[PDB]
mmCIF file of all heavy atoms in Angstrom:
data_model
loop_
_atom_site.group_PDB
_atom_site.id
_atom_site.type_symbol
_atom_site.label_atom_id
_atom_site.label_comp_id
_atom_site.label_asym_id
_atom_site.label_seq_id
_atom_site.Cartn_x
_atom_site.Cartn_y
_atom_site.Cartn_z
ATOM 1 N N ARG A 30 25.252 8.497 10.683
ATOM 2 C CA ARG A 30 25.015 7.868 12.005
ATOM 3 C C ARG A 30 24.388 6.468 11.707
ATOM 4 O O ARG A 30 23.764 6.261 10.781
ATOM 5 C CB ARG A 30 24.084 8.703 12.930
ATOM 6 C CG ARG A 30 24.915 9.424 13.983
ATOM 7 C CD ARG A 30 24.080 10.319 14.809
ATOM 8 N NE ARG A 30 24.903 11.091 15.789
ATOM 9 C CZ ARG A 30 25.879 11.862 15.453
ATOM 10 N NH1 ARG A 30 27.052 11.168 15.094
ATOM 11 N NH2 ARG A 30 25.742 13.116 15.297
ATOM 12 N N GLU A 31 24.627 5.435 12.759
ATOM 13 C CA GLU A 31 23.972 4.202 12.596
ATOM 14 C C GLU A 31 24.426 3.578 11.210
ATOM 15 O O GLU A 31 25.531 3.873 10.710
ATOM 16 C CB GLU A 31 22.526 4.317 12.556
ATOM 17 C CG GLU A 31 22.051 4.654 14.052
ATOM 18 C CD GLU A 31 22.374 6.044 14.404
ATOM 19 O OE1 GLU A 31 21.521 6.920 13.949
ATOM 20 O OE2 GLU A 31 23.265 6.401 15.059
ATOM 21 N N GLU A 32 23.654 2.702 10.604
ATOM 22 C CA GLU A 32 23.933 1.991 9.254
ATOM 23 C C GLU A 32 25.165 1.125 9.496
ATOM 24 O O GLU A 32 25.506 0.634 10.626
ATOM 25 C CB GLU A 32 24.359 3.193 8.249
ATOM 26 C CG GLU A 32 23.369 2.881 7.047
ATOM 27 C CD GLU A 32 23.760 1.535 6.366
ATOM 28 O OE1 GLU A 32 24.770 1.559 5.862
ATOM 29 O OE2 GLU A 32 23.081 0.601 6.515
ATOM 30 N N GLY A 33 25.840 0.750 8.456
ATOM 31 C CA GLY A 33 26.996 -0.066 8.569
ATOM 32 C C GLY A 33 26.864 -1.408 7.545
ATOM 33 O O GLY A 33 26.178 -1.310 6.553
ATOM 34 N N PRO A 34 27.339 -2.488 7.949
ATOM 35 C CA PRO A 34 27.342 -3.791 7.285
ATOM 36 C C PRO A 34 25.982 -4.405 7.494
ATOM 37 O O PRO A 34 24.959 -4.160 6.758
ATOM 38 C CB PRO A 34 28.428 -4.621 7.889
ATOM 39 C CG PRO A 34 28.747 -4.030 9.353
ATOM 40 C CD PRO A 34 28.163 -2.528 9.274
ATOM 41 N N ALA A 35 25.805 -5.219 8.596
ATOM 42 C CA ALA A 35 24.436 -5.838 8.830
ATOM 43 C C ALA A 35 23.454 -4.710 9.343
ATOM 44 O O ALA A 35 23.192 -4.493 10.425
ATOM 45 C CB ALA A 35 24.672 -6.849 10.029
ATOM 46 N N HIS A 36 22.820 -3.970 8.308
ATOM 47 C CA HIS A 36 21.829 -2.969 8.673
ATOM 48 C C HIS A 36 21.074 -2.666 7.500
ATOM 49 O O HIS A 36 20.936 -3.353 6.536
ATOM 50 C CB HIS A 36 22.756 -1.666 9.068
ATOM 51 C CG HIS A 36 22.554 -1.419 10.605
ATOM 52 N ND1 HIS A 36 22.644 -2.287 11.585
ATOM 53 C CD2 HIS A 36 22.189 -0.229 11.138
ATOM 54 C CE1 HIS A 36 22.307 -1.799 12.712
ATOM 55 N NE2 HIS A 36 22.075 -0.499 12.580
ATOM 56 N N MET A 37 20.298 -1.479 7.531
ATOM 57 C CA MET A 37 19.425 -1.140 6.381
ATOM 58 C C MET A 37 19.667 0.361 6.146
ATOM 59 O O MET A 37 18.989 1.274 6.777
ATOM 60 C CB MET A 37 17.906 -1.349 6.881
ATOM 61 C CG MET A 37 17.376 -2.484 6.180
ATOM 62 S SD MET A 37 15.636 -2.808 6.687
ATOM 63 C CE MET A 37 15.791 -3.062 8.392
ATOM 64 N N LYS A 38 20.523 0.602 5.175
ATOM 65 C CA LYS A 38 20.943 1.990 4.902
ATOM 66 C C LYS A 38 19.711 2.944 5.023
ATOM 67 O O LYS A 38 18.779 2.996 4.150
ATOM 68 C CB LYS A 38 21.353 2.039 3.348
ATOM 69 C CG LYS A 38 22.862 1.652 3.231
ATOM 70 C CD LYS A 38 23.053 0.121 3.194
ATOM 71 C CE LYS A 38 24.511 -0.324 3.690
ATOM 72 N NZ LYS A 38 24.196 -1.058 5.021
ATOM 73 N N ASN A 39 19.724 3.760 6.156
ATOM 74 C CA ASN A 39 18.629 4.649 6.411
ATOM 75 C C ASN A 39 18.986 5.676 7.463
ATOM 76 O O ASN A 39 20.115 5.834 7.737
ATOM 77 C CB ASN A 39 17.358 3.897 6.761
ATOM 78 C CG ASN A 39 16.132 4.364 6.002
ATOM 79 O OD1 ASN A 39 15.324 4.876 6.679
ATOM 80 N ND2 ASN A 39 16.064 4.026 4.800
ATOM 81 N N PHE A 40 17.982 6.095 8.194
ATOM 82 C CA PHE A 40 18.300 7.000 9.461
ATOM 83 C C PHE A 40 18.820 8.427 8.937
ATOM 84 O O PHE A 40 18.111 9.287 8.774
ATOM 85 C CB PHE A 40 19.295 6.348 10.431
ATOM 86 C CG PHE A 40 18.888 4.925 10.629
ATOM 87 C CD1 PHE A 40 19.739 3.902 10.393
ATOM 88 C CD2 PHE A 40 17.507 4.636 11.088
ATOM 89 C CE1 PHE A 40 19.403 2.524 10.597
ATOM 90 C CE2 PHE A 40 17.163 3.267 11.336
ATOM 91 C CZ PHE A 40 18.082 2.189 11.067
ATOM 92 N N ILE A 41 20.195 8.489 8.707
ATOM 93 C CA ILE A 41 20.756 9.762 8.224
ATOM 94 C C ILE A 41 21.518 9.566 6.913
ATOM 95 O O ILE A 41 22.683 9.491 6.861
ATOM 96 C CB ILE A 41 21.674 10.427 9.245
ATOM 97 C CG1 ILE A 41 21.023 10.192 10.625
ATOM 98 C CG2 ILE A 41 21.907 11.868 9.054
ATOM 99 C CD1 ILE A 41 19.759 11.075 10.795
ATOM 100 N N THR A 42 20.851 9.283 5.867
ATOM 101 C CA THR A 42 21.522 9.115 4.558
ATOM 102 C C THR A 42 21.840 10.510 3.912
ATOM 103 O O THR A 42 20.908 11.241 3.528
ATOM 104 C CB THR A 42 20.608 8.256 3.667
ATOM 105 O OG1 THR A 42 20.015 7.212 4.359
ATOM 106 C CG2 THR A 42 21.475 7.508 2.588
ATOM 107 N N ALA A 43 23.139 10.708 3.656
ATOM 108 C CA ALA A 43 23.410 12.032 3.056
ATOM 109 C C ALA A 43 24.036 11.762 1.561
ATOM 110 O O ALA A 43 24.588 10.649 1.431
ATOM 111 C CB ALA A 43 24.504 12.767 3.928
#
Side-chain angles (χ1 to χ4, degrees):
Chain A
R30 260 180 180 54
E31 288 77 78
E32 234 295 288
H36 245 49
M37 257 184 290
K38 274 94 206 107
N39 227 251
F40 315 123
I41 317 291
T42 320

